Structures are given as structure tokens and as C-alpha cells.
Amino acid sequence: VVDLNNELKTRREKLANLREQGIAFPNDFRRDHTSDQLHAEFDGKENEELEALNIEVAVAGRMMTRRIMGKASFVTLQDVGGRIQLYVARDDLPEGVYNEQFKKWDLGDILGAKGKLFKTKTGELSIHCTELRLLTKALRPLPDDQEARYRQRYLDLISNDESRNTFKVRSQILSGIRQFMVNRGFMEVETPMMQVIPGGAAARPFITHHNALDLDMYLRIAPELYLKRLVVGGFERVFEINRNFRNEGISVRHNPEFTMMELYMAYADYKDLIELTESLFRTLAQDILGKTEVTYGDVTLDFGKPFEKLTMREAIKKYRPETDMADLDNFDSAKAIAESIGIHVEKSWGLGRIVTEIFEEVAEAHLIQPTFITEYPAEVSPLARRNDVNPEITDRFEFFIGGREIGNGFSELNDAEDQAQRFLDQVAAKDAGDDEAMFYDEDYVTALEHGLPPTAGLGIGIDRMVMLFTNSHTIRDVILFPAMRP
Amino acid sequence: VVDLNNELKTRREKLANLREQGIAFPNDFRRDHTSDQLHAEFDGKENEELEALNIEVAVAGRMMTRRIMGKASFVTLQDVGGRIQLYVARDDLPEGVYNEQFKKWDLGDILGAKGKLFKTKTGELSIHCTELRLLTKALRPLPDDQEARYRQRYLDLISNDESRNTFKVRSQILSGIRQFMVNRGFMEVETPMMQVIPGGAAARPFITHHNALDLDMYLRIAPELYLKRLVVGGFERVFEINRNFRNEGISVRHNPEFTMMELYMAYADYKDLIELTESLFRTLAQDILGKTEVTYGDVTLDFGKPFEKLTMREAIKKYRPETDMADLDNFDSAKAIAESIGIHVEKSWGLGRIVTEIFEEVAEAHLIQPTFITEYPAEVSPLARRNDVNPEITDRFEFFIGGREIGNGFSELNDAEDQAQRFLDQVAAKDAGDDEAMFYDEDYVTALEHGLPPTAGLGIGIDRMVMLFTNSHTIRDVILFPAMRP
Ligand SMILES: N[C@@H](CCCC[NH3+])C(=O)O
């Protein structure tokens, strides 16, 4: 309440005094151990050992908790790898430090300590300090909606062990993805974030202006088209992990800027990539989580049993059994069905979009276990190769875990004449009402004209993947600094 | 001249015919070797061996060159890892293929081939084809200012072996940087690209608007301030490799969006990072280039001899020996010197800026061998810890190789009261004429108030590093898709 402004004014005056005494913010203390290391190597030893071993250490961290017992105290110190106990004794430190200084410090303050190890009555490992000092004065006290954890992630990180575990694991996932890709000869590239024409996905984009060149640019909604140019140029196995910016809304399972991986391999089809995705997940879970059966909320995600495969038509029939599939071949009856399950059909929608929507509604949520849905109507797949036997559908697949879309992949359209026509279609839909349709891209049609080998491309939502790997149930739990509404 | 439009119209009609015959863009051919692999494992064998070994292969690539010799031909095929020879014989292929098809294909076309290996009269390894077919029709012919190589990098990549070598090595550098960092316990993070207030460097930024939140955002000129928040939160060894966007101009050694690495380690100072940089380069060169002495243009960069260390004052005196250092302590005389060497002094400049400028001019170009310049006036170092003995300078360093700045690092300012005052300074300079000054950042002052441990941070220009590693002499040689003027 008002506790805070007193805390501020006290911590304030304490610093102005520290300045008069000398150098308030020293940067010469050097530690040599972190809690996790100390615990790891020494929690298996007893006090008869330690006293005789006489192993001295130096550590630094944030003073979390301090139990003052007159002429001796106990402080809990928290560093990058955990918390460690300190026994602070007035006579075992230099003269005056414990009284004129230590007792005058505050919780939140960063300290440095050095002393021999031992174990307290409780069995906890501790450092009997011979030296201890203030490194950084916390002008503000430790912490105390749940959106506070997102406006000031450092506070959350200091407090919540799980967050720090979550992100540590995120790094392990990326590191493991890269290790995996390179092992299959994929080379990582960096294409532009700014683009003169945005594309490679369906989304309203962010506009920016290059002051100098008098030119509007765009934050990339996807790097797809540039990565395919690299395949034209002869990089036959490229992948890229980085942002995309979609001017959508901050609806919790969304963030305006997220992390995606795209990978392309020439002389392969969507199947080759379906099978690649399997190994990616099944291998990462095993390596990063030890087990193949993985707990996510109420369910146990079985990454060990072969991922399920259904075509869209199959999925529609499986989750809406009363469905007369024959109605899905006709426009009026398919619109009837779509509206009978409560979908508002846009004026710009054609049959394939309607069917795709119906699938979205009736089935997506039920795909809890790792699932691949295949064979999408051409309409909704502007960059995908047509199917040989049925041109009305494309060699395309989506991938779902936990009722969410974790992946997307297809046999690439390298038919430039067709690719250009699908752009005109996308441009028509845009004029017709679709704020998410694609822009026509001449330079790309051209790149294709020079020849794009047959190729299969795969996109994967890195954030959502981490969620399923760390048991997070909002994307804001896997993004260090989510975009917060003012 | 007009050759092109004939080539187009011919390649056009050839495709319309292919469509009538069947599926023009097949995606079922599967290769099993790349040129580099074939050359690597088989260029050490003679023809008496090969004929008896009878090793069959399948490959695919772009038809680069075709010497038609009547009832037999030779084609050069180029894939991700090089070129490989094909012996195409009318009778050794299925009936009709060589005449009704092969001879009707074009250069640029992507093909797939299968056949037994052997060696021609010249000693070159080749594939005596039993099967060969068209995968992708090149509706446009192969290639033929030098800016063409940048407007259509796929063309350049197809033609120029060195480009493809350059980028392959870039990947190796990044991969090696990450390997290096993680080996020292650094954890990689991803902070925002969009930011409500831009900062962490001096540069005019790119503005964008989030349509929904009615809020202007900015492309990050640097991620510095967010990475330091992570150190407040307890990640004591973080690093991040990703873009920065500076609304500068496309002046060849610049690109509006480039790749930077930042790394922070708590309980360390600028020295600890100077020494880290040494190992980074010396180790990468050795690993990636085999040698420590490395050729760059006219000079041999000696990464083996200990990097040179000079303070700015030292450097000024070394490259302008007639300089009376005493004049550098006074404002009018230091401005006199600056203007006597042809520097226009801005109305908003103070002594430290003037001296820094003088250094820039007189010395930067001469720093050819790996060099660290230390001790920068406070004025030009808004986020750096003051020096204990001399508050007028900061514990800061720049790093130079080849007359260019490859690095930047300092002991971090964790004095919130001072940090806020330096912002007011930056805000003053901005109002006074500096299009590159910093914005005031409240949320950051606050993060510091909660306490930032003593820390040292290091920034490194990844692109410029690659240049020096691949002998490129423009940044546009290390960026797959440089920003080209319309
Ligand atoms: N660009 C796609 C991912 C790759 C699709 C296959 N070419 C997306 O944003 O979903």
C-alpha cells in the first residue's frame, strides 16, 4: 500500500550515503561457483567430511530472505542456477561489516560472498562467510492481474522457478532442432525481415517506410518465397528459424511476432516431410524430456506410437459421422452444412474454402495426439503442387498436437504459369473481402520461370512446440517478452 | 538482345506441348548422390576399377552445358554440391527419349539421371545414363551493373562458385559461434524485434504501427536493454544473434538490416570480454579456416599474435604524432584540432564527442590488424560504467579489424540514477540536432532500480566478421538478399 513508498525513500537515502563512502557500484568481485554446481557436487556429502575437506568458495546473487538472529544471521542467495545458504557471523567477518553494513542492507540487494562450506541442522548446504559485500543496491523491493508477470518478466523470472526452467528448455529445443537439421545436411540461412512485397502465408501485415528510399516495406509474414529462390539458386536443403510479424490481435494463443522454422528439400514431396516431422518430435522429446509419453495438461501425449494420418475428408467424416460426404462435392449443400454447424460463410468463399472451414470446426479440437491432416482443396493452398490424379486438391498437409496446429507442409508448386494464376486468385479474394489474402509477386513468378526443382517445404511453429514440451498452456509462457496491451 | 524473347517464346511453346503429353512438373524422381560426394569418393579411382565395380547412381541437377555429338552427347549437371558429367547415348536410353525428348530440352532445365560410373578420355568422372528425364522446364535461359548479382541472387548463386562457398562458410561461422558460447554456459534468448521505445545503440530507427493497438512500434535498433532485463531477472550469461534495423542509407558497407550478436555475463568487466573476443576469433579462424594467418585483400591478418590494445588517447597520439595531448583536455583547442583535420564540429558536440571524432578520423583506418581501443569519454558512452579513478571516461572498448569496427563492449552501467541522467543528456542531444541520439526509457530505469548485477556486455557485427573470414570486401557479399535501390 504505502509500504512501497517508504521502502523507496529508505533505499534511496541508503544509496546517497553509500556514494559518500566511496564507489557505490563496484565491479571487481569475482565468484567461482553457482548454487546448482555447489548443490550438484556437494549435497551428497556429510558435515564430518566438509569440516575436514575445508573447501572454500565465492558466490554472488540476490538476497532473497534474511533471518537476523542478533550476532549471527542466515541469508538465502539466489543466482542464475538457484538459491544457496549463507551463515553471516559478526565475528567471522571483518570488523564493522556485519553491524555498520550487512544489517543495513536490504532484500533484493545483490551481494558477493566467500567462505567455507558446511551443513546446518536441517541438512542444508551453506557457506560460513569470511567475506561478504554489497554489489548492487536494489532501489526497489522484491515483487509483492497475472499480466504483471508479462509486463516485467524480470520480476517473474526472479520469483518463479518454472519460468526459468521453461526458457532453459526452450534453448535446448532450438539447439536440438539445429543439431537435427544439420545432421541431415540442411544449411541454415537468413533471408530478409523487411520485404517489398509480403507473402508466404495468409495474414494482415505490418507496414514500415524506409525514410531514405521513399519506399514502403513490410515486416515479413513469412520468408517462404525467398527461401525457394535459394532452391532455384541451388541450395537444395535450406532451413531458417526466425520471426514473422502478423498484424493480428493479441488473443493469448497469438502474439504479433513469433518464431517459425521453415525448411526446404529439393527432390522430395510432402510425405518425405511428414516422416521428417515425426522423427523431429519423437527425437526431441526423447532427448530433451527423457520419455516419449509426455504429460500436457489433462492428457498424455504419446510421441511413441506412430503419429496418426487422416485426409481432410476422412477427418470430416470421423468427427461428424452423420455427414453425407456427397454434399461436400456440391457448393450449396456444403454451404448448408457449414452454416448448420454455425460457420458464417464469407461472400468470397468457394467450395474448397467452405470444406476446409468445416474441417477446421468439426475436427481440429479433437486432434489431441500428434496428427497429420492431408489433401487440401486447391483454393486454400496457393503455393502447393496440384495432385496428379485430382487437380482439385493439392499435395498438402497440416500437423496438429493438442487441438492446435503445430505444423504445415506441401509439395511445392514449381509451375510458374499456375503460380501466377493462383496469385490473381489471391488478389481477387483480397479485393473481395479477405484481409488475409496474398499479394501478387512478379519477381517470384520470374524466379520460378528460371526453374525451381521439385521440392517439399515444411513450416513449424517453434513457440507452440515449446508449449507442448514445457506444459505451458498460453504462448505468453514461452515468449520472454510478450506484447502487452497498454 | 532479341535472343531472349525468342528463347522465351520457344521455351513457352515447349511447355504447352509437355502439358498435352502428361504431367509437366513431376515430383517422383529420387536421386541418391550429389556431385561433391561422387567426386569425393570416386575421383581417386581408375577406369579398370569402375567398369568392374559396376556402381550405379542417380542424380539430379540443372543442365549447365550440353555438347551434342549426333547419336551421343555430353551434359554437365549442376546440383547443390557441384557439377557432374553425363554421357547421354541414344541407344543406352529407352527408345525415343534421346531423340523425341532429350535433344528437345534446353539449358537451364532441371533433370534427373541414373546410370553406371566411369571416366572419360580427359580423366573426368561421369555417369553413363540408362535413365534421364526432365523434372523442371526452365521457361527462362541461364544468366547471360554487377548489382544484377544482388537483385537476383539465385542467378548469381547458380553461376558463381565463390558465392556458394561464402555463404556455406557463413553458416559454419554462426554454428561455431553458438558452439563456442554454449561451451562457456551462455544461453541463447530471443527478445522482441518490435519495441515501444527503441534503444541500445545510436541510429535513426524504422517506425511501424500496430493497427489493432493503435500504437506506434519500432524495429529494434538493438536488443541491449531487454537483454539486461534478463540479467536483472537472473539469466547471468545470455546472448542473442539476430537483426537490428537502422533507417540509415544503403552505402555499400551498410545494409538497413544486419546481423548482430550480443552477449552478457554478470560479475565480469570489459576486460573479461576483450579476452573473450580474442578467443572467439582466434578459435573460429583456426577451426573454420585451418590457419591463424588469414589473407584479406592486400594484407595478411595475423589472428595468431596477441591482438593489439590501445586506449583512445594512445591511438590519437600514435597516428597523429605532432599532437599536443594537452589540447585534448580543453574544448576550444580540441575543436581547433578536429577542424584542422577537416571534421565539421556539430553544435551539439561536447569535448568527449570531439575527441572521439578525432580518434575516428586519425586512427580507425590504420587499425588493420585485430585491435582493441579502450577508454571512451562518457559523453559518447551512455550505457557504460564510469571509470573509478576517472569518471570523465567509461570502462568501454571498441574492436577493429581491417580498418573497420567489428566489435563493441563495456562494463555495464547499473547505476539507475546515472543511467536516467544520461538519457536526459541523449534526449537533449536529440532535440539539439542529433538524429542518432537515444530516447528516454522509463521502464528500463525501473528495471535497473530493481537491481542489475555488475555485468559486462559485448556486441559483434556478424556480417563484417564473415567478410574478413571469406575475403569479401562489401557487406553485400555476405547478405543473401541485400536491400537494392529501386
Ligand atoms: N510458409 C509456411 C510454412 C512452410 C509451408 C511449406 N512451403 C507458413 O507460414 O505456414
Ligand SMILES: N[C@@H](CCCC[NH3+])C(=O)O
Ligand atoms: N548494443 C551494442 C552492443 C553491446 C554493447 C555492450 N553492452 C551495439 O549495438 O553496438
